[PDB]
Every structure is written in C-alpha cells, then in structure tokens.
Amino acid sequence: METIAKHRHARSSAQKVRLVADLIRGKKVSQALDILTYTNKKAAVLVKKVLESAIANAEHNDGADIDDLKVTKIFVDEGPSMKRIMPRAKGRADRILKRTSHITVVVSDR
Amino acid sequence: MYAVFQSGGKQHRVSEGQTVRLEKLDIATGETVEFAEVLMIANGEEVKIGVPFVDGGVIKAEVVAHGRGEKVKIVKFRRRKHYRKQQGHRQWFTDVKITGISA
Amino acid sequence: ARVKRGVIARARHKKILKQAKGYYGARSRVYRVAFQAVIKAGQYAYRDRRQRKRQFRQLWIARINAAARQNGISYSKFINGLKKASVEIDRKILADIAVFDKVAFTALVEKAKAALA
Amino acid sequence: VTGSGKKPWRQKGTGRARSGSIKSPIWRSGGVTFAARPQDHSQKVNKKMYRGALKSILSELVRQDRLIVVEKFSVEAPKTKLLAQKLKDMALEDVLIITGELDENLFLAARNLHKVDVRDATGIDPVSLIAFDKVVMTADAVKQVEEMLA
Amino acid sequence: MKTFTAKPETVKRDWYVVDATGKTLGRLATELARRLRGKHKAEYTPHVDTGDYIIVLNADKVAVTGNKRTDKVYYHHTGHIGGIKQATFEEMIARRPERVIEIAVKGMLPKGPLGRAMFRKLKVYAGNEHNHAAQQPQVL
Amino acid sequence: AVQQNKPTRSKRGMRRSHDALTAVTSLSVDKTSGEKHLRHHITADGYYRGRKVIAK
RNA sequence: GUAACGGGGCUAAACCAUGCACCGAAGCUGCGGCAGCGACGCUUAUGCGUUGUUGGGUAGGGGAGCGUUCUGUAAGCCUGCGAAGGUGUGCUGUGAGGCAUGCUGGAGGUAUCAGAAGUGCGAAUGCUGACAUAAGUAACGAUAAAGCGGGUGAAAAGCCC
RNA sequence: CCCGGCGAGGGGAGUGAAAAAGAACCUGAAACCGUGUACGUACAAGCAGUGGGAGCACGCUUAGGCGUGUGACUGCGUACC
Ligand SMILES: [Mg+2]
Ligand SMILES: [Mg+2]
Ligand SMILES: [Mg+2]
Ligand SMILES: [Mg+2]
Ligand SMILES: [Mg+2]
Ligand SMILES: [Mg+2]
Ligand SMILES: [Mg+2]
Ligand SMILES: [Mg+2]
Ligand SMILES: [Mg+2]
Ligand SMILES: [Mg+2]
Ligand SMILES: [Mg+2]
Ligand SMILES: [Mg+2]
Ligand SMILES: [Mg+2]
Ligand SMILES: [Mg+2]
Ligand SMILES: [Mg+2]
Ligand SMILES: [Mg+2]
Ligand SMILES: [Mg+2]
C-alpha cells in the first residue's frame, strides 16, 4: 500500500465525516492541521488522527520523509451500523442506526 | 461517375461506393458471375451528359462485385397488450455487399 | 426437489437489468425497470422503426419541394412532369440531388417543367 | 408443522397484515404447502409384456455378445484372483458381461468395483443384460423353447 | 449511403431586408416563418437546427384586410391572478409595434426550443432605412 | 406532512450543495511562524507580545 | 385566463360549383426472410426450389419446446497445467436459452438418450433479512437556570476540591 | 517495529501455497453508499424512452467515411398489475 492508514467504524457516520474530508485534498500533507485543526466538528478530530498516522507511515512504510507528499486520496465509506430500540408513543417510532465510517487517507507524490 | 437502380429499394444513390443491398437467391458465397445491372443507370449522370434520365442511349450497366453476402443485425422488436406479450421474435436478412466496378 | 431458483433467478434479472444507457434512477438499479421500462423500449421501438420510413419521406419531399420550386414548378407540378415517361421515373430519396448534384437536379426540373404538357 | 397455535395477529387493523395459522405456506418460519408422502412408485408390467423382446441381444450384439460356454467347474472353492485366467478365454474382462449358468455354485466369486456379475439363474432382467457388454449366455442346453430362461 | 444531409449546425446564413410597408401585412408572416427555416433553401434540411437571416423595417404600414384594424383582441395575460387579461385591439397596440403584430411569426414557428432560436432574431424596427441600429453589412 | 413519491437519487444531492464546508485563512504573526490560529497571535505561551496567559 | 377556428393568422387561408395535381395508414405493391395448408416442379421414405394463400387477439382449447434439482447411462468423460458459483466479453437461437473465453474463485461437475419433479415469481396491505426515503430534519423527559478558580486527564460546561 | 489515549483503528515486518484466508476470517451477488475519469448539463416544461441526430473524449484503418461512451437539438409519446 502506497502509505495509507484507513480506518474502521470510527462511529461518527459517513455523511458527517464525509463533509470535513472534502476540506482536505490536493496539497494537504503539510496541512495535517490548520485546515483541520481550525474546524471543530467530531469528524475533524477523527480525520486528523488517521491523517497523522498516515503521514507517519512515511518513515516506516516507505521512504520520503514528512514534508513532500500530497494526499491525493481521501474518502469515507459506510461502515456497519449498530441498531437500538427507542421508547416512544407506545413504541411505534424506534429504529435508531448509530452508523459509522472510516477515512482511508492516502499520501504520495504530485 | 454517379449512377442508380432499384431492387428491393432504389438503393443506388452513391456512385460505386460498394454498399450493401439485397441477396442473390439460391445461395450466397462470394466470388461472382459478373452480373451487369440494367440501364437503370442515371445515365451515369456524371459528365457533360448528366442526362435528365436513365433513358439516354442504350446498353449501360454496372458489374456487381459480390464483396460479401452474409451477416445479420438482430433487433428485439416485441409487442404486448395488457393481457399478454408476444415479446419474443426476430426476422432478419444478410444483405449482399457488392462494389460495382464503374458505370 | 431442489428449486433454489436463486440460480436462474440472478440470471433473468441481470439479463434485462443490462440496460447500458442506465436510462435514469430505478430504471437500472431496481428490477422494476424491465417490464416497466425495458418493455417500453421494445414498444416505442416496434412502431418508430418501420414508422420512420415516412418521417424521412416527409423530409425528402420537404426538401425536394424546397429545391425544385426555387426554379419554377413546385413539388406538386414536379413529380407530375416526371410522371410522364416510358422509363423516366427515378424516385425520390436519391432525389436529394439538390444537395450534391445541384446542376443535375436543376437539369432534372427541366425534365418535368418542360415535360408538363 | 410445529404449528402450536391458531391465528393470534388481530385481522382487521394493525396496518399491513392479514394472516391466520402459522403453518402458513408463506411464513418463512415453516409449513410446506401440500407436503409429499412416501408413495409407492412401483408400476407393474403385464406378464406377457414382460417376456416380450428381451434377449434380442444375439442378433444385435452378434459380433459381441451371444456366446455360450460353461460355468467354469474347476474354479476353486472361493477364489476370484485367478478369475482372470478364465476371463481371458474370451478376452472379455472388465467389459462387464454377466453369466447365466443357473447354479449358485462357487462361481459367485465375482466381486469387484463393477465388471463381472453372476446372477446365473432364472432370476434375471434385461436391465442387466443391457447394462453389460457381453452377456455370456453359457449355461448350455439351459436355453430351450419359450422357456430358454437362463 | 444514409441519404440525409447532416446537421451543419446552421452553417448557412443569408442576410435579407424586407420592407414591412407592404400590401399583405399578415400574409407576409408566412414568407418570413418559411424563410427563417428552409423555404428558398434546398439543402440544410429543416426539422434539425437551421435558419436564415432577414430583417423587418417600419412595419407600421399594415392594415390587414377586413375590420381587423379594430380587433386582433390581444391580451398578454400575466400569471398574477387578481383578474389579469389585457385586451388591446390591434390599432391600440399598433401604436408601439413590440412583442406583437410584427411578432406574429412567433406563433407560426415550431415554437419551444430551436424554433425559438429564430424568433425575434431577425429584427423589426419601425422606420425603414432611416435609423438601422441593426447590422448594416450585406443584405438584399 | 405526508410524502408521496420520494426522489432520493439525484435530489438532495442538490440540497447538499449548500452543505459543503469552508476553509479558513489567517496569519501566523511575527513570533509564531505558523499557528496564530485565527486573528489571535499564538497559543504556545498565550500572548500577543508579552505577559498574557503564561509567557515570560 | 384569450378558451364556442387546436394556436397563429385568414377577405378569401370561407362557402358553392367544376376539373386536374400533390400530401397521406402497419391498407395494397415492390424486395428479402419465417412458419401452416393446397397445389406446381420435381425429386420421388423424405425432402427441397416455385407458387396461391393464412398468420390482431382477453377467457379458453390444441401443438411444440428451453431451463433447473435429483436417478440411470457414469471409477465413463471434464478439472488444482484450476470444477461449481460470481462477473465481463464474443459468437449463436424465433424465444425460453446455448456455447467459447478473459478475470475472480477454490473445489468438484456431467454430452447423450431416458426417468422423476418441493420445476421457473413482480405484485397476494404476501413471509424473513438487508438497505434506502423523509433528514442530518424533530427530539434530547418537567422553566428548581447557574458563575468562577484549582486538580486530574489525550481531552472537563457535566467527574474530585 | 511505528502512528495512537500503554484506546480503537491501522501501517510494516514475519506465518502461510495464498492474510486479495487475520479471526467481521470460504465463495462473496443484489439493493443501498461513495472517490476517480469521458461526455451532456444553470432560459427550459410532462412515464424520461424510442426514431433521427451534431459535437466531444478515446479506438479505427496505408482515407476509405466505421467501434465504444456521452449525448445538444428534433418527430413521436399518460408506468405495470
Ligand atoms: Mg411544407
Ligand atoms: Mg382459539
Ligand atoms: Mg404501507
Ligand atoms: Mg420447515
Ligand atoms: Mg408377476
Ligand atoms: Mg409540435
Ligand atoms: Mg402521388
Ligand atoms: Mg406507409
Ligand atoms: Mg395469433
Ligand atoms: Mg450442483
Ligand atoms: Mg403478476
Ligand atoms: Mg423538512
Ligand atoms: Mg426548522
Ligand atoms: Mg434533562
Ligand atoms: Mg471473504
Ligand atoms: Mg445552454
Ligand atoms: Mg437511433
């Protein structure tokens, strides 16, 4: 794998995380923060974690120290959703799907 | 030089151009026997004598080449009322090629 | 004693579902399409094809009329002249001569204009 | 099926519904339409229609099956190993073939994956006569008129 | 081959200049609607995209035939409830030949897209060749 | 509040248009050659130039 | 809201009479092909080429077939030098479908003719399961609201002081 | 071994014929949800296709007038049970 990091579940729903993901791409890399560290949403803190872990795999997985890179890939996928009942007006309306996601961050050359 | 003719349709617009047509009869196979068309020729319609009609001088026909006389085309085409569907049918032809030497 | 239609089942659906165009929405993803839309395609197809034989004819004469009249005698008078002949009577379609062999066509309007008794 | 109860789902109302017992041939839970019984299967053929056209083999398998020899008397008590020696007398071995000597002697020694079958006796049906390559009629004299039963 | 001149993407465009101050008024519209498509044209098959390029002048020189100089109703209703309907007899509108009268061709065209491509794109005006805010180049 | 046919596919994808997020754009200030967050200055010692939060 | 020519627009682009011409349907003709029947030519079981003709179709009647699971023919044949299954593609059949093969796949499958069916789904407010929609919308449970300084901690409005 | 809260999760390395077998683990289809690329698309009305059809992206061929995708514009034209 060309230095990835991905994820599994996370527990913040795709749509939620998919939003902040768009914020970063193209240049990125050197943007491990600022464009991420200055946007407070649960999804943000999640992408950063894996973002660093990913850019970290620049010294272990392959060469090319942390400075260049690109982050040509970022996308969240629908992860298994937990189910829970919801006490309501006699129990008519109750589904509740926690929903989860990932991140699958990537970093390479330009 | 332009030209023209009928046969299962007046498909003879183009000069020579080698275009598909109908089919022989007994059996296609290629080769040839040199079947000159008829004086349906648009008089050749190409030269200082692009005559209003094919009726310009006697004997004037093109020789069929018989390039390729096979192939099909396949087309579903299926009707259906509200209580049934004849949906299932197919009827095609091969259409011989022919190149036609010259008018 | 083993139906397990699942086998042929998957095949039947995939067959019709194979509508490249994708048309739009459920017309591809959902099997609902098939007899609903794929069937329509077959219907709209059965008539339009053999029907078109005229749509172009309506066109041929539409342009044939717009060409022959530009130089005396309209489409109504045209074929009327062409009508008289022992063998002279090359039909329309190629009659689009007006676009390529203009001289020929205009030389074909005389075969009628002067033909009309 | 394990249908332990009558319809307990309140017919009218409850939005989508309509149901009764649960053996219900539609309920995934269980219950199969018109089941299926042990039955008999066994159809019976007339007595005459039974003997009709059987050992037609002779004429047909002429150049193949229609040979008559012996039940190999010298065959040891219970030995199949040297059955081959006796098989080569016709060069027909694993080519199946059944014998019809009409004597449940030690010749029933034929035991293998599937080749030579004894059954040398009156009890014999075409199915076998056709399931093999060269039904060695043998027996000798056993074959007579209408009752040439082997 | 497949006889049918392709779609030159309206490759032809012959400029022309009518007079408007004629003796047929409404009869003229047709020769305009026909022109803005494939009338005097032989090739450039209609149906598909196409057109021409002519232009009106004064136009204020029309009177129809009968007493149509007093009718022609004309009411450009505007989706605004409160009782719309703007009835204005021809002569009452002939005061300012705008989206009407001279624009009698709009109703004669294929209508909708493509046909609307021709529409007013022929110019009108109302003064002949005195002030031509339109293209001056080649015309007939 | 009923809801007949629901055009899930395509639709909503348009409402999502006004849902995309936005990026920031601020300086780093003199001392901090990077952070400064947004129109602040720095967090390290929390100061714009001197005794603020816990600096020198 | 024109709304009592479909619209435009028409003094004849109306009507009446007269005659010719043109447009115009899956109707008829031309060309090719499919199938049933009568004939024709033959050949002559048979069958094929010519021809006349018939081929809208609900209930329904009749006649032909495809495909699937299992049995025989099968320790035969196909396969780890890659089976079933999933996916693409190409050729093929009137259609049900058929075959060849790329990739996946990790072990089985079965020409043929015949036999028996838990034998073919789009609907029954069908049964089970999975996933959408509304929608990141409503709502977060008594209107007895809380502020601050420390501590801890990756992080404290909610935890400890 | 490395990122991380001595998390979760993951990236290497090693086991293995395979980890495109990692314990959610055989094969893994469909609905449904995404990232990427080619084309269409912000003055245009309706079962969304069908017929015609330009252009554009690639593929063509010692042109030869075609293949695939997309389809502006245009005649028609109210799903199934
Ligand atoms: Mg016309
Ligand atoms: Mg009871
Ligand atoms: Mg309901
Ligand atoms: Mg059961
Ligand atoms: Mg008996
Ligand atoms: Mg129209
Ligand atoms: Mg006529
Ligand atoms: Mg017709
Ligand atoms: Mg019928
Ligand atoms: Mg099987
Ligand atoms: Mg049904
Ligand atoms: Mg709402
Ligand atoms: Mg609100
Ligand atoms: Mg509370
Ligand atoms: Mg798996
Ligand atoms: Mg536009
Ligand atoms: Mg087409």
Side-chain angles (χ1 to χ4, degrees):
Chain A
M1 288 158 262
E2 201 296 303
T3 168
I4 323 299
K6 68 204 312 76
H7 199 75
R8 255 267 130 260
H9 303 220
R11 199 261 171 175
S12 182
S13 101
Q15 150 159 231
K16 250 80 161 299
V17 301
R18 174 53 194 170
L19 225 59
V20 298
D22 300 297
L23 281 165
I24 52 180
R25 210 161 299 189
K27 307 72 182 180
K28 230 279 81 64
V29 187
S30 302
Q31 279 312 312
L33 299 308
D34 314 315
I35 188 169
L36 284 177
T37 203
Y38 299 138
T39 53
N40 199 308
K41 291 209 64 180
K42 216 173 85 168
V45 187
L46 310 185
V47 308
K48 168 171 55 60
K49 259 271 198 298
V50 56
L51 189 289
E52 309 176 307
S53 302
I55 185 60
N57 292 176
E59 262 305 317
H60 248 54
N61 164 53
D62 300 316
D65 47 27
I66 302 74
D67 33 53
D68 189 299
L69 305 313
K70 188 180 186 180
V71 185
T72 181
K73 293 239 298 179
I74 290 182
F75 57 94
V76 316
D77 282 33
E78 255 168 46
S81 182
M82 303 179 269
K83 186 158 187 171
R84 232 73 70 173
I85 305 177
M86 186 69 241
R88 270 227 173 69
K90 297 100 239 47
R92 195 66 173 298
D94 15 57
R95 221 192 314 210
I96 302 181
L97 309 195
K98 310 305 176 183
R99 289 182 178 297
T100 57
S101 71
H102 313 62
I103 186 63
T104 48
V105 174
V106 178
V107 295
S108 52
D109 62 58
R110 294 89 70 149
Chain B
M1 294 176 255
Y2 284 173
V4 76
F5 181 61
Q6 306 198 70
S7 76
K10 194 155 298 188
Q11 171 51 60
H12 240 237
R13 211 293 72 184
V14 186
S15 171
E16 28 187 53
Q18 4 289 69
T19 181
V20 255
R21 292 170 41 59
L22 318 177
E23 12 286 300
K24 287 218 290 183
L25 248 173
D26 54 310
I27 181 64
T29 174
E31 267 64 55
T32 186
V33 189
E34 291 298 83
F35 274 55
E37 70 177 87
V38 305
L39 189 121
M40 169 46 145
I41 45 83
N43 213 87
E45 249 174 56
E46 246 306 300
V47 72
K48 41 205 157 188
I49 327 300
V51 181
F53 200 66
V54 178
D55 285 340
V58 75
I59 56 176
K60 279 303 302 178
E62 288 70 294
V63 187
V64 294
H66 267 57
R68 181 64 72 190
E70 293 107 66
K71 276 58 183 177
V72 296
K73 193 190 193 67
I74 180 180
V75 285
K76 206 174 185 64
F77 275 39
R78 298 166 190 191
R79 302 104 118 300
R80 52 164 271 110
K81 298 302 179 182
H82 164 291
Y83 341 97
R84 65 102 199 194
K85 58 179 175 221
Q86 63 184 70
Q87 177 228 62
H89 203 353
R90 194 66 202 71
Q91 235 306 304
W92 44 245
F93 32 55
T94 87
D95 310 334
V96 304
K97 216 57 189 175
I98 305 296
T99 78
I101 322 303
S102 273
Chain C
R2 301 181 79 152
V3 217
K4 260 62 180 182
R5 320 87 103 299
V7 286
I8 61 175
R10 176 79 222 113
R12 215 73 173 300
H13 289 46
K14 182 179 179 181
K15 175 190 297 179
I16 57 84
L17 220 59
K18 195 174 66 179
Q19 295 322 81
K21 272 291 169 54
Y23 297 170
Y24 182 53
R27 283 186 169 63
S28 301
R29 290 298 209 134
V30 181
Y31 174 58
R32 70 91 187 204
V33 51
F35 303 77
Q36 240 71 302
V38 96
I39 249 180
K40 250 298 175 57
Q43 311 186 76
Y44 280 176
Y46 184 73
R47 189 52 271 141
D48 286 40
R49 187 82 297 278
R50 202 168 188 297
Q51 139 194 289
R52 213 66 196 193
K53 282 68 170 301
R54 71 210 190 189
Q55 201 101 304
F56 279 136
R57 196 164 178 296
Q58 177 192 184
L59 161 64
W60 277 313
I61 83 170
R63 61 153 90 287
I64 294 172
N65 135 59
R69 70 158 51 219
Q70 176 259 55
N71 28 295
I73 270 55
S74 56
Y75 181 90
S76 292
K77 309 194 193 72
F78 194 16
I79 313 178
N80 205 190
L82 307 169
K83 237 180 177 182
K84 267 98 292 183
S86 299
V87 181
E88 314 188 65
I89 197 172
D90 213 69
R91 296 308 178 188
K92 87 322 165 61
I93 169 178
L94 46 288
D96 201 330
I97 313 291
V99 295
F100 42 93
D101 232 344
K102 55 287 297 181
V103 291
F105 180 72
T106 196
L108 222 300
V109 310
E110 294 131 32
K111 192 194 73 178
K113 186 150 71 289
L116 280 172
Chain D
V1 76
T2 190
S4 302
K6 220 78 286 182
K7 76 89 66 83
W9 322 109
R10 179 182 173 66
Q11 180 163 298
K12 191 154 292 296
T14 58
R16 21 170 68 211
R18 185 225 282 176
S19 69
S21 299
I22 313 307
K23 77 184 187 309
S24 205
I26 307 173
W27 276 218
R28 173 219 78 103
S29 63
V32 48
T33 174
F34 16 64
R37 291 158 254 63
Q39 71 224 306
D40 166 290
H41 269 198
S42 168
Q43 296 287 260
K44 176 232 61 181
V45 306
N46 312 292
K47 62 137 216 311
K48 227 309 174 185
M49 252 185 75
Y50 175 57
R51 327 193 218 91
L54 307 190
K55 300 160 294 69
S56 318
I57 287 62
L58 167 137
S59 166
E60 311 165 306
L61 298 189
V62 40
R63 46 204 160 183
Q64 299 179 59
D65 170 41
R66 67 174 187 175
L67 45 163
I68 302 76
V69 190
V70 189
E71 53 197 29
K72 303 81 173 185
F73 63 110
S74 183
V75 175
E76 305 214 308
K79 292 278 69 178
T80 191
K81 12 132 53 287
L82 288 317
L83 211 186
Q85 297 172 170
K86 307 148 192 57
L87 272 180
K88 274 55 274 301
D89 70 347
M90 67 175 143
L92 293 349
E93 46 182 295
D94 305 16
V95 296
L96 290 166
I97 90 89
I98 64 127
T99 324
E101 84 204 72
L102 294 83
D103 184 309
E104 287 166 292
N105 198 57
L106 45 72
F107 189 58
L108 209 161
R111 267 69 170 296
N112 57 66
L113 125 79
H114 199 156
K115 300 147 189 172
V116 183
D117 204 307
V118 227
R119 293 164 49 61
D120 295 51
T122 49
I124 171 60
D125 182 288
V127 292
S128 306
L129 308 174
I130 302 178
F132 296 63
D133 273 60
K134 299 192 179 65
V135 173
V136 293
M137 276 119 248
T138 35
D140 289 348
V142 141
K143 283 64 177 179
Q144 286 182 172
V145 211
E146 202 179 79
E147 288 314 309
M148 68 288 98
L149 251 79
Chain E
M1 320 315 276
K2 301 292 184 177
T3 171
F4 173 86
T5 302
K7 175 115 66 176
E9 198 188 314
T10 73
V11 77
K12 107 137 187 295
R13 268 145 179 54
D14 287 15
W15 6 240
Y16 298 103
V17 177
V18 302
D19 49 51
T21 172
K23 355 71 168 295
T24 27
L25 334 319
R27 314 294 294 231
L28 131 160
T30 79
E31 279 187 55
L32 274 67
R34 245 301 134 193
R35 213 64 289 296
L36 300 154
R37 191 99 91 67
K39 175 78 285 298
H40 299 162
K41 176 240 66 176
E43 34 203 293
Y44 316 113
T45 166
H47 292 44
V48 289
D49 294 50
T50 183
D52 192 67
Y53 175 44
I54 61 178
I55 182 175
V56 193
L57 285 296
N58 14 50
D60 281 47
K61 271 279 65 190
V62 290
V64 205
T65 42
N67 219 310
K68 291 206 211 62
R69 214 61 190 292
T70 199
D71 80 323
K72 279 260 59 183
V73 279
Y74 288 135
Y75 19 50
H76 325 70
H77 183 299
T78 62
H80 291 288
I81 187 58
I84 308 297
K85 280 303 142 72
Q86 318 299 65
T88 57
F89 315 143
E90 202 271 54
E91 67 187 73
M92 175 187 258
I93 206 171
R95 312 263 299 195
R96 207 318 82 176
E98 59 125 65
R99 178 181 60 273
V100 70
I101 173 181
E102 66 254 79
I103 312 301
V105 60
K106 184 166 184 288
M108 283 194 206
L109 297 179
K111 292 154 293 187
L114 164 131
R116 189 158 54 233
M118 300 76 112
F119 85 131
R120 183 265 189 172
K121 268 170 61 178
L122 37 55
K123 256 301 176 180
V124 178
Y125 291 126
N128 189 51
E129 296 183 300
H130 187 58
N131 200 170
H132 219 58
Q135 205 200 69
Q136 221 69 186
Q138 298 179 296
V139 292
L140 292 182
Chain F
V2 63
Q3 33 277 300
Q4 317 220 177
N5 331 291
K6 305 273 78 287
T8 163
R9 307 277 289 87
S10 184
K11 185 65 178 185
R12 182 278 165 171
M14 279 131 54
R15 204 207 88 60
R16 178 272 174 293
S17 302
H18 293 66
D19 300 312
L21 273 155
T22 60
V24 297
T25 23
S26 177
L27 259 94
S28 60
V29 103
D30 66 273
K31 278 104 184 182
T32 258
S33 300
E35 180 223 342
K36 180 178 181 56
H37 279 44
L38 185 62
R39 192 194 153 298
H40 184 207
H41 189 96
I42 180 183
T43 179
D45 295 55
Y47 67 102
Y48 180 73
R49 190 220 156 166
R51 255 66 74 187
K52 242 63 246 60
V53 190
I54 50 175
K56 285 177 176 174

